[PDB]
Design a protein around this ligand. Sequence first.
Ligand SMILES: O=S(=O)(O)c1cc2c(O)c(c1)Cc1cc(S(=O)(=O)O)cc(c1O)Cc1cc(S(=O)(=O)O)cc(c1O)Cc1cc(S(=O)(=O)O)cc(c1O)C2
Ligand SMILES: O=S(=O)(O)c1cc2c(O)c(c1)Cc1cc(S(=O)(=O)O)cc(c1O)Cc1cc(S(=O)(=O)O)cc(c1O)Cc1cc(S(=O)(=O)O)cc(c1O)C2
Ligand SMILES: O=S(=O)(O)c1cc2c(O)c(c1)Cc1cc(S(=O)(=O)O)cc(c1O)Cc1cc(S(=O)(=O)O)cc(c1O)Cc1cc(S(=O)(=O)O)cc(c1O)C2
Ligand SMILES: O=S(=O)(O)c1cc2c(O)c(c1)Cc1cc(S(=O)(=O)O)cc(c1O)Cc1cc(S(=O)(=O)O)cc(c1O)Cc1cc(S(=O)(=O)O)cc(c1O)C2
Ligand SMILES: O=S(=O)(O)c1cc2c(O)c(c1)Cc1cc(S(=O)(=O)O)cc(c1O)Cc1cc(S(=O)(=O)O)cc(c1O)Cc1cc(S(=O)(=O)O)cc(c1O)C2
Ligand SMILES: O=S(=O)(O)c1cc2c(O)c(c1)Cc1cc(S(=O)(=O)O)cc(c1O)Cc1cc(S(=O)(=O)O)cc(c1O)Cc1cc(S(=O)(=O)O)cc(c1O)C2
Lengths: 90, 90, 90
Amino acid sequence: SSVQTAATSWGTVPSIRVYTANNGKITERCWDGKGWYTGAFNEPGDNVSVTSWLVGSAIHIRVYASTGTTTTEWCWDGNGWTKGAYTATN
Amino acid sequence: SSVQTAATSWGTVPSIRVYTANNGKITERCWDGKGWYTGAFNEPGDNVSVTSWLVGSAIHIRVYASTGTTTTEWCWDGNGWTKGAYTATN
Amino acid sequence: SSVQTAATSWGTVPSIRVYTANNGKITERCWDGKGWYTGAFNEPGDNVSVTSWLVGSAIHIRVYASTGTTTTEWCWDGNGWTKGAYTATN
Ligand SMILES: O=S(=O)(O)c1cc2c(O)c(c1)Cc1cc(S(=O)(=O)O)cc(c1O)Cc1cc(S(=O)(=O)O)cc(c1O)Cc1cc(S(=O)(=O)O)cc(c1O)C2
Ligand SMILES: O=S(=O)(O)c1cc2c(O)c(c1)Cc1cc(S(=O)(=O)O)cc(c1O)Cc1cc(S(=O)(=O)O)cc(c1O)Cc1cc(S(=O)(=O)O)cc(c1O)C2
Ligand SMILES: O=S(=O)(O)c1cc2c(O)c(c1)Cc1cc(S(=O)(=O)O)cc(c1O)Cc1cc(S(=O)(=O)O)cc(c1O)Cc1cc(S(=O)(=O)O)cc(c1O)C2
Ligand SMILES: O=S(=O)(O)c1cc2c(O)c(c1)Cc1cc(S(=O)(=O)O)cc(c1O)Cc1cc(S(=O)(=O)O)cc(c1O)Cc1cc(S(=O)(=O)O)cc(c1O)C2
Ligand SMILES: O=S(=O)(O)c1cc2c(O)c(c1)Cc1cc(S(=O)(=O)O)cc(c1O)Cc1cc(S(=O)(=O)O)cc(c1O)Cc1cc(S(=O)(=O)O)cc(c1O)C2
Ligand SMILES: O=S(=O)(O)c1cc2c(O)c(c1)Cc1cc(S(=O)(=O)O)cc(c1O)Cc1cc(S(=O)(=O)O)cc(c1O)Cc1cc(S(=O)(=O)O)cc(c1O)C2
């Protein structure tokens, strides 16, 4: 099956995160200037989007993972991934 | 199919906009720091992408809504959604 | 079937790049404030995502083009599109 990706980046440095949806799972590949590695993010979804923003030098990431009509938001705010408040009535 | 999303964010609060394509309909959910609400954007499209940029504190959003080989650009520039000049020969 | 797009933008003009996956080919439309034109980017893919960042006034673009389970990264750093180091085990 044909993977679907989403990407975000930050910093003059920079850092890149690439999310791939495949077989109902979204996984994460990371670049911080020194090679690609597998990130901590591992959550269910058939579809993925992402956005991120800096507050000073602190990154905040939001990943929108969708299966069927249900989209779940995942939040990185410096200390692990947690489910966000996002809802929609799809 | 699953729903398909696209996300953008700006500032440090931040503001977030999440666009969802659901069986050919695109809708918008918005966060400005207190809670999610349904945004004004509601247009047809089977696929969606988005980008945004600030000019000072003024946000500009471009949503690319695709049905078949026709992509329609939708523009937010402070005063409602308008069709943009984007064309492609798909 | 519908085409699938990805978009990025930078600066305050702004510059915008829209990537469209259509029948296994990804092409690029560009805006730099003065009309849409067809960009140099032409690579295979059924799925596309993009991110970009500025270093001063120099843009850096990364396009993730997927065919089946294989994602290829393409890099713009001011001298044409080049192969990126991205890998994944999908
Ligand atoms: O990688 S290929 O593009 O050459 C390829 C295409 C198809 C294939 O069946 C395979 C490879 C073999 C294959 C690969 C994988 S995967 O490496 O994990 O992606 C999985 C499977 C498989 O037969 C099993 C499978 C899973 C799913 S899933 O429910 O989405 O996870 C769907 C399918 C599967 O065969 C159906 C399917 C979808 C697609 S599509 O490209 O997504 O439309 C192509 C092919 C398919 O068989 C047609
Ligand atoms: O993709 S690359 O081939 O360019 C690459 C090569 C090396 C790298 O260190 C990395 C990428 C970054 C990297 C990625 C990963 S991943 O998450 O699995 O993708 C993991 C690591 C890492 O540095 C951490 C790591 C783990 C282990 S383990 O304890 O055995 O699991 C060993 C190593 C690690 O760096 C050593 C290592 C092995 C290898 S090898 O492929 O096994 O020869 C290459 C490189 C190495 O630094 C040299
Ligand atoms: O839910 S299933 O995994 O069993 C499933 C997978 C595929 C299917 O084609 C169907 C079911 C049948 C089917 C279901 C629906 S739905 O009930 O509304 O979900 C819709 C369709 C369909 O053929 C028609 C359709 C719509 C769209 S959409 O307009 O973008 O929503 C896309 C597709 C459709 O076939 C393409 C498609 C996407 C996907 S994906 O998992 O979302 O990438 C899987 C399958 C697809 O045929 C492959
Ligand atoms: O690839 S997509 O994810 O966009 C997709 C969306 C839909 C789908 O039903 C399919 C794929 C499956 C599918 C694929 C193809 S193929 O790429 O050519 O193999 C063809 C069809 C189909 O259902 C048949 C078909 C053709 C056409 S037309 O040639 O443009 O007239 C229209 C439709 C078809 O089902 C109706 C249709 C339109 C649209 S759209 O919103 O108008 O783009 C989305 C989906 C549709 O099923 C919903
Ligand atoms: O060459 S020009 O000085 O006439 C020029 C200035 C600007 C422009 O937007 C363009 C040309 C159009 C243009 C062309 C191309 S090309 O097809 O490859 O020739 C590429 C771009 C572009 O905007 C994309 C682009 C590239 C780069 S760079 O590759 O890192 O040099 C920087 C920028 C781009 O938009 C940002 C930028 C900086 C500057 S600055 O004067 O350096 O601050 C002026 C203009 C800019 O668009 C403002
Ligand atoms: O245009 S083509 O797709 O036909 C093409 C094929 C090959 C080529 O060598 C090139 C183009 C030229 C070329 C382009 C670039 S780019 O500017 O970055 O796009 C880079 C290179 C290059 O030869 C250098 C290079 C990179 C790598 S990488 O490690 O995978 O990034 C591998 C090679 C390179 O020469 C060896 C190589 C691999 C492959 S393969 O497709 O990976 O099997 C094809 C060709 C190769 O020369 C054979």
